[PDB]
Design a binder for this molecule. Structure first.
Ligand SMILES: *[C@](*)(CO)CC[C@@H](N)C(=O)O
Ligand SMILES: *[C@](*)(CO)CC[C@@H](N)C(=O)O
Ligand SMILES: *[C@](*)(CO)CC[C@@H](N)C(=O)O
Ligand SMILES: *[C@](*)(CO)CC[C@@H](N)C(=O)O
Lengths: 324, 324, 324, 324
């Protein structure tokens, strides 16, 4: 059997409430990794599992500095011969951020599978148990190698680069509308459909094993009457980059343009993404800053932070966004 | 033959570029309303149309005070016996904000149909001509009455309360994933599917007659390491409300909570929405602020601004969000 | 507390397997209604529940004659002053067929809610318990009256006229891509989004209470090289109607046309639907047969069968398809 | 510039109607290939194009014997030094069938791009011009090689193995809900997202050179009261295979089982697919026949016919279905 380590960080999958009917407002990251493993003994037939408690928090509190530590730990684990893959339990809210970060920084082809749950472990029809079993099956399957970081939940396997939480409260919230899933798990069998056509893991130039923190990047929303003062505030607090969750295709109002101009003059890298949820923000030389390709705001921030650890050259950063 | 006024405000539907191959980075709000009408003469066979140039700008620059005037003009036009419906051409980027605003403030059952286009009028296979023809057909059909404000594009009829631009650059970008479309237009025939189960138009309490400004409301994004200083900034600039495009179901980091607590202490109304794109943000007494129901950040801001013209009572505002 | 009758017919929601990992190939309709009720005792705090075992079969074996009896029993139940609503457990495979049948034949505004499950009751993370709890909540809410027959599963409420099983094996399989959901259930709260703009239940002319059998209607698929002989066979076996799951918008090959013409010559009513899964099959005077509006093949067969109990007039049947 | 052959077969992209408002009921395959090219002269700036009129028919009439000649003609063309890629204009109704056939029989890495249109060439806002332009761009791009056969339309690049017409009449009808698009075309630029993880083209064992016909395979629908006699009919007409567009995960009624048992006894290969539209039909020893993996009925018929040109062994055919 494959040797899989289950690195727990918290989340609803490890969440609990007083009643089985409470599916909201519960406490995330309240249960220990062994408790999750013990709740689904069946996993032992899929692999030799070892639980490790990295953290136990609600993912809304996951921070870059900690995600960095998470990446370094997974790298140490995957470096071992006695480890065939890693399953990371994480909160659903920012799992797309943590997953994409590792997608870009893990220097190994061994499976790295993030797993989450939309209902707490104590809930009626809790999804966590099955999601966990599926994540371990994916992590231990030899066919799962070299596919980049994955997010497993609700019978689906999504690429960290495309998958995103699209719904605030549904079990089937994780989807990649335009890119689909890398594969699915039905009847205890994995069906691989796609291989992402982007750079990742072993072919990524991003290495952070020698860092303890990342460049500061904030996200500003785009909407009617969007204020210039928010750009002022960001610049003033030392951001190194600003990701714009823009209206439509990263379109900018006169006030947004004024703010971006100020940011650029201060050496801040401006990256134009979109608030819409899907699609391409195309290049436009008549607008300030760079464009995020198909990266949504949350994903764009992660890549920009990592990009900033290697260069401040706009052209190099722009190419990164079209290839990662 | 129905009397339809086509009120123009700008957008890509009135956009142009030097070549038929340029579908991005073009000039929005470039063409006059009569140019659009004459480009699709067939609308004249469907109704007695009258073009009126309200404005001609890119929708990223559309502002609340201008939308306020737009709503007042439409209410005025619909009060006339010689006007059966109004079609409003608008840029795609913020049409959902302007459409929802009128959805709440136009006191008439006569059809108010926003229309737009994802490709400029000069582009190969431009969608504007057919979108406009369909919009006029919907506005002039008597079966279209009392349905709330609609947004017509790509053969679909979406409610202003549900429809949103989901893709940065595709023709089929406008969708209401969980709510579907009010109707579709195929083979020159309208197929009505649903009636929205929410308050609007003639049953709305949002009277804006005579107003010349709206309460200031800004939107702050939720993500890993989101900064508390953004809340400080908004508060310092006298916002009356803050809409939070939060992680998951409006989940808040320790920094976001600190920021929200300061806002609430200063009398700012905090509305928790989601950055995910769809779904319900459920009540949670353990978290600060109100919840946006299924309203996304953009729609949430519009409703909060209108709510604030009538009350500052959180309970009344919250009920508005569950009924409008 | 409302009085809710839970009418069981079978399905995976009442399915069993030897192991908790067995999610496919299990036995449907193995557990009794009372076993389902005691399994999720929480339903007892939402309503005064009473179980009734109408049947216990895999829905792939549900038949028109049995659905007729189901509709008749439901009408009987709802006529009682001591019954406020009914929840019907049914297999997922043909639930859209049984649901739409009752949608057209139940002469009452009291809630009729079909409920199902994609995972057997014995599977880990089985969805049945929560689906049933939600179905009862919907059935007993006064706001649920007069919305037509609904299908509740995976936190969603779908109209029997639009909802369909879109995926062979996923929990989120039931969707109405173009029409959306009537509502959703999150955090033990119901959020009603739409009201179907079609005739049903109390406003339907399809009363079948005095019937024991229904007109035979078969469905023939459209594809490259589709054979004429399938039509000859249907005709020879006395079909009164043929529903065509056609290529595109009910397009027909030279062979299909010959088959349809032979059928029409022999007194059979031909209804052209689509194999695509969604959308409108528009009127076309250059093609034989009627068109199914937005009804997919499964739904079209149900409406055609019922239509044939009242008329053989093509003009009348066609209007039914545009209004029901 | 690259040398691209535009091989025309007909379809709505070559359709014509007497007015610009008629988007349905038009005549498909009415315009010649050179006419389409002269309508979008911009293609000549993307490549040196040469039109070839293979046929001019509505795709509902495309037959296996003709598709064989199409595959053989394309193999012939791609073997040439002077042909960098081929764009094939085809009707939308069965393009998924023709495309998947070539996907399995064209032994070249050069781009094979099927293109189509949902609105006739004479229609207002016709999509054909842009679709063709995008198809030529994809066919001539070096980055497009070795991706399997593609279907380009509405700014999307879909794999022949996953793409399907999901809506009877919309412009955005072609989608692969669970698998996404291989890539998208926005702002005259191609954005490749995925590479399908299946066997195709150069790695296919399906040699069809020399064949003038294919084994007969028919499709039968699954629904309540499905008749056993259609199986009898298929058997009587000597079908070599039967694809079952089944209820749910290829579930079978008692009548369907009886019919399948008869077919199997007669040496007919039975393949269980699904009518739902998406998903995996998992293996089940308790049921007759093979399972179609994620292939829908139309795709399954194509693969089964080709599978039968190699063997009748069920085990081998089942493996073809899990790998192609
Ligand atoms: C429970 C559903 O995921 C809530 C968990 C969320 N706050 C998190 O990101 O941990
Ligand atoms: C063209 C497609 O909508 C871009 C127009 C947009 N900037 C606007 O909102 O006007
Ligand atoms: C289990 C998922 O619904 C299979 C049930 C199906 N055969 C039925 O319709 O009963
Ligand atoms: C026009 C839209 O595709 C109709 C074409 C269709 N009948 C075909 O397959 O050719």
């Amino acid at each position: 059997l494959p040797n899989i380590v289950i690195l727990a960080t918290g989340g609803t999958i490890a969440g609990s409430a007083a009643t089985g009917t409470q599916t909201t407002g519960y406490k995330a990251g309240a249960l220990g990794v062994d408790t999750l493993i013990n709740a689904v003994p069946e996993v032992k037939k899929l692999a030799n599992v070892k639980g490790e408690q990295f953290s136990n928090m609600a993912s809304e509190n996951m921070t870059g500095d900690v995600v960095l530590k998470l990446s370094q730990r997974v790298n140490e684990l995957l470096a071992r011969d006695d480890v065939d893959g890693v399953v990371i339990t994480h909160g659903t809210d920012t799992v797309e951020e943590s997953a994409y970060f590792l997608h870009l920084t893990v220097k190994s082809d061994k499976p790295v599978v993030f797993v989450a749950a939309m209902r707490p472990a104590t809930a009626i029809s809790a999804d966590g148990p099955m999601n966990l079993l599926e994540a371990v099956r994916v992590a231990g399957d030899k066919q799962s190698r070299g596919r980049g970081v994955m997010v497993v939940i609700n019978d689906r396997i999504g690429s960290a680069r495309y998958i995103t939480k699209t719904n605030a409260s549904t079990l089937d919230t994780f989807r990649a509308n335009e890119e689909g899933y890398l594969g699915v798990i039905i009847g205890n069998r994995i069906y691989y459909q796609n291989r992402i056509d982007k750079l990742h893991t072993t072919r990524s130039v991003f290495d952070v094993r020698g860092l303890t923190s990342l460049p500061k990047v904030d996200i500003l929303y785009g909407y009617q009457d969007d204020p210039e003062y928010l750009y002022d505030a960001a610049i003033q607090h030392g951001v190194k980059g600003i990701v714009y969750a823009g209206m439509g295709a990263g379109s900018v109002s006169v006030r947004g343009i004024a703010g971006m101009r100020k940011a650029l003059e201060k050496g801040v890298v401006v990256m134009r993404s979109t608030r819409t949820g899907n699609g391409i923000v195309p290049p436009d030389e008549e607008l300030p800053g760079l464009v995020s390709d198909s990266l949504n705001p949350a994903h764009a921030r992660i890549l920009l932070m990592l990009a900033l650890t290697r260069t401040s050259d706009p052209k190099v950063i722009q190419e990164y966004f079209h290839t990662y």
